[PDB]
Amino acid sequence: GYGKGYLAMFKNKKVRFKVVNSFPDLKVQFVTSFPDYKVKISNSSSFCEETIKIQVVTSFPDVKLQKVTSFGDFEAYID
């Protein structure tokens, strides 16, 4: 599906993460260190640029994300 560099297009933007178990746009592993991107998780579904289907995995992700509260590469509303 999508590749590692896709999320780079949403610098200082906000996207919607749709949790799925099959056919995802991105397999995502959440990490506490050394991510590919830092993501601020949002409590509002407002202003989402686009909807990206993610599958949470623990091995072989497309991208490693680190949840942060400040200074994030982009924002995400998870549904």
For residues 1 and 62, the answer to whether their CB atoms sit within 8 Å is yes
Per-residue tokens: 59: 């091995």
Ramachandran area for residue 45 (φ above 0: left; ψ -120 to 50: alpha; else beta): alpha
Cβ neighbours of residue 71 under 8 Å, at least 6 residues apart? Answer: 38
Cβ neighbours of residue 40 under 8 Å, at least 6 residues apart? Answer: 67, 68, 69, 70, 72, 74, 75, 76
Distance CA 48, CA 13 (A): 8
Resolution of the entry in angstroms: 2.3
Distance CA 20, CA 43 (A): 19
Per-residue tokens: 71: 């200074």
